[PDB]
Design a protein around this ligand. Sequence first.
Ligand SMILES: [Mg+2]
Ligand SMILES: [Mg+2]
Ligand SMILES: [Mg+2]
Ligand SMILES: [Mg+2]
Lengths: 296, 296, 296, 296
Amino acid sequence: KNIIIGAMTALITPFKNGKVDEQSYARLIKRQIENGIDAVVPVGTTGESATLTNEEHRTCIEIAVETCKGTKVKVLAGAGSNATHEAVGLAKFAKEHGADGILSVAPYYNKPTQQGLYEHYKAIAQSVDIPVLLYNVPGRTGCEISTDTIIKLFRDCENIYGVKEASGNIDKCVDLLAHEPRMMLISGEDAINYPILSNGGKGVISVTSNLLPDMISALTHFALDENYKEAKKINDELYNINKILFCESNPIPIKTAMYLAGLIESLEFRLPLCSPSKENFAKIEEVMKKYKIKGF
Amino acid sequence: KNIIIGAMTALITPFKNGKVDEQSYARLIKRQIENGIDAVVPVGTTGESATLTNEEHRTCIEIAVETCKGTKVKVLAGAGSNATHEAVGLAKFAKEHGADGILSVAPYYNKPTQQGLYEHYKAIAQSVDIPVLLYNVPGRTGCEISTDTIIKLFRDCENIYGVKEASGNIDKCVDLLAHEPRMMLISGEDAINYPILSNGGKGVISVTSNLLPDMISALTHFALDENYKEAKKINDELYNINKILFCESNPIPIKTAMYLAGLIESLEFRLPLCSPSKENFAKIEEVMKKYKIKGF
Amino acid sequence: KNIIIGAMTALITPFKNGKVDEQSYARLIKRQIENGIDAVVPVGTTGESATLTNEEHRTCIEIAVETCKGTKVKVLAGAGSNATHEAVGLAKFAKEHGADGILSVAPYYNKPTQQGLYEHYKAIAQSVDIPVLLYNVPGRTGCEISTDTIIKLFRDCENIYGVKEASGNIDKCVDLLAHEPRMMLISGEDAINYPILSNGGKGVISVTSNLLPDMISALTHFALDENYKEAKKINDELYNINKILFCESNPIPIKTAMYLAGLIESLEFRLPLCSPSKENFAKIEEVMKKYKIKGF
Amino acid sequence: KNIIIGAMTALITPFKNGKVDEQSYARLIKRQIENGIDAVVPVGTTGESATLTNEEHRTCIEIAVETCKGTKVKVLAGAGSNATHEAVGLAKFAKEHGADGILSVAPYYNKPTQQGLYEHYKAIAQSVDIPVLLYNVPGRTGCEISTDTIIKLFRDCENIYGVKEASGNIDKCVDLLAHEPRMMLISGEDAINYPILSNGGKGVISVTSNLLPDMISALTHFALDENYKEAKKINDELYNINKILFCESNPIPIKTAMYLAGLIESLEFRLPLCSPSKENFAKIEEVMKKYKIKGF
Ligand SMILES: [Mg+2]
Ligand SMILES: [Mg+2]
Ligand SMILES: [Mg+2]
Ligand SMILES: [Mg+2]
């Protein structure tokens, strides 16, 4: 199977006067490339996929593909939906814009059955010929892609090559790689990046890497090269920022950090997302002061 | 305040050859009207809002508005979204096409803060001049509208008149009606319809009423007239069907039941929703046999 | 079946210089009797069952039996354990000292199966000839007595006449009384006393009644005679004190309230229970000011 | 600090005709010693701590002390309670009988506050001069020892040297060892033994080692020797048996496994524990079939 692994970044989508800041988006993606990042995830959950239009979805996938062109950096485009017909459309569309693969979240809100999840993802995989990475985040979706459903999908469809897990369940991460050791388990939970990698995980799709791309990539590459003592050291010193970046729902804290670090120009969200509490604003700024934040 | 209360039905949306069966949809809505139902809810979660197009969304709202014309039955249209801009658009659209009010579910998947939930619903409320009923279902949305947020919204925007609760939290319903007894608490959980009504709840938005509208109608009005013994007897008698109508994700069991009762011609869902088990199919069929299901 | 229903109080156990204040204990039970309480629960969870010795267990049961001598107030003695052979000893023993019935908590910590729970309670019921009330509170024990396990015990064992539910699950309270309407459902959660009573519950085992015994008894008997509007009015007015009495683990808040009201002489617990935070201390003093606390 | 780390076994307690099979106990403890175990834990939760008497508590600790005479294998005796005065007593007695250290479970059922938990363990630590290991298992106790409480106890009392964690929370184990890298984190969840060890944990207190002591010992020592390829290899192969050993409450599956393997002589529990369902009984024997169970 063709795969997309390593240190990956769920990119924020900077706004300026209600529109996508196409200059900051490109500037931010070349900052990721210059710090050892292996792939970028445009218009994911961290990029406020829910409040973006279809034309903004296309623009940012295109900017990612073009900014990475020539580099070894891959583009793993966010293309998911709780409607199967729409998920297939978004997958085909992503391929037409030059993405190397798609990240497809489990259908949210409507809670499909395990059988339905299989048929949902099977249709998506047969629409395109590019890698498909599943995204399991039950706290947000209200549903769980079971270990047997993930493995069945991995074995039955070529392009499904693994799953990005955000479930805080290291038991499940042992379960997966013990019954199907060939899949690519990707951490979608920054705080436990090292434990997932040390059990055979082959990458992360990180939120913290928006602010500290150099540290997240070093952590990932240390682990893949089996230097677990140096990988754990970075994971240990990243814990404080890893937790405070979720003091409120992602991506509210990370955009606050990016704005405070001067990497984005305005602290703008699209409703129902908004600026954080005054207390958490100070707590994010305080925790930031103990990390050296790479510039442009 | 303008209100929409009483016995209400979250309508299923029947499909035939992948398209909305517009003639059964109208026939089903007139079956609700003829059995004492006070309002119907088109294109809600039970109506598979997620897999419907904008043009079908409008079609089923129009069919609902058109068939309740001349009757006393109100149309509480489903118009919610995890994007405020679309939720405002969907709300304005419902009013322009004759809906009497909107049911607006809490933003799903994206997890807005309580502050963000306030600004989200405030934008929807200021967009229209028809009643707006909040919908809290944390198991599906991943977020919870706190009691203080609901009460703040009820007091700050007048078209917001209450909340539909599917939370399995009778403590919260005591909390709500003890600190703000003027709001309209609506039961969104058929099994606990009576406890919610007996604490001051003023209506239900039911799933069971799709199959047994006469029984749910009697329950609601018995309770509203404070005949609790006669209301509770129906609630106790409906418990068995109330539970198994959720043996799989709603609306998988109720559509199965409607098909088994012969009220729709095809047992079709749109992926990622699917037909249930062969075993869940048989236990839905068994429990149905202990109830009298009115025909057309 | 012999039953013990109505308004009941989970008695606190006042300490003085590390010993049980035996005269205050009697005085406190006499304040309950004079304010319409129907039964008292010595050596329960609210009475710090865990940190009392067997001889203090006996002393407090005997003081309760002696103080209710001549009155119509029943003694529902706490006699539970997660070791069956000891739970049987405590049940036999409670009867030998004049208790009218026993409240038996579900085995904690060791998490028995439903089969194990069945055999546990069957042994206790066959050990004595006084009414046995099961006590289900999964948040404290780590296990749940299922609806079918409760009903099987009610039908198979003569002495078992109901359950005291502290599970925040009004669905389960519909489940119980719809499939077995002859059992005595007792509310073990003060905030939802009225909803449980309005569904057929026949009494409460209260914590707040330690502070406001007259108000809890008025609520109970209003509800039992069916004046539900009068019962709900008291339950709505009691919500604030009912919640703030659990800002920390029971009985830490209630003992603080009893001390502030001057009903007990010293704010003593046995470790690992301790005095509350400074902030929670102030919050209890706030809420008490909105209620009339009957003296001696 | 003096510590007790490495591969450890939470010993089952075999019964024969309602009595502790003392002879069989010693034979099983010497089977653990002969297979690389570094310490054994008598009368813990796996040993049915709740249903043993105080003198049976003494009997099983003493046999352990006597059977480890002459070996390097330590005795980490279970001596815990939800009553602090009893927890101090059980610790003193455990030391007076020759134990090398204490395992002290968090107070169950009575849910002490974080402040109360600190004073609880401080009393136990100041009671004895042998190592004290904290035990956090919130699913059974109903309480959680916060990370800050664990760290405060580690720094404030000499003999408190770490915590055993059974919380299914790999985030918390990063939290602990990143803010206090000097403590001894011990895994109390067999399925995630390696991830906890791979993050700096220095031992396990196992259930599986009752059945497969050589495999659990090899896993730990490989991990302690930083041979992470071989530690994960064993952990991946043990996942199936590790999970099926909790299809019912521990120690119901492990005692069933020991009986099926012929390592214990009768399948007896003390109520409320009992033999498993036939269905789960068959599932345990099946999963056992892919492992080599060392004899005596
Ligand atoms: Mg596109
Ligand atoms: Mg009309
Ligand atoms: Mg009338
Ligand atoms: Mg409590």
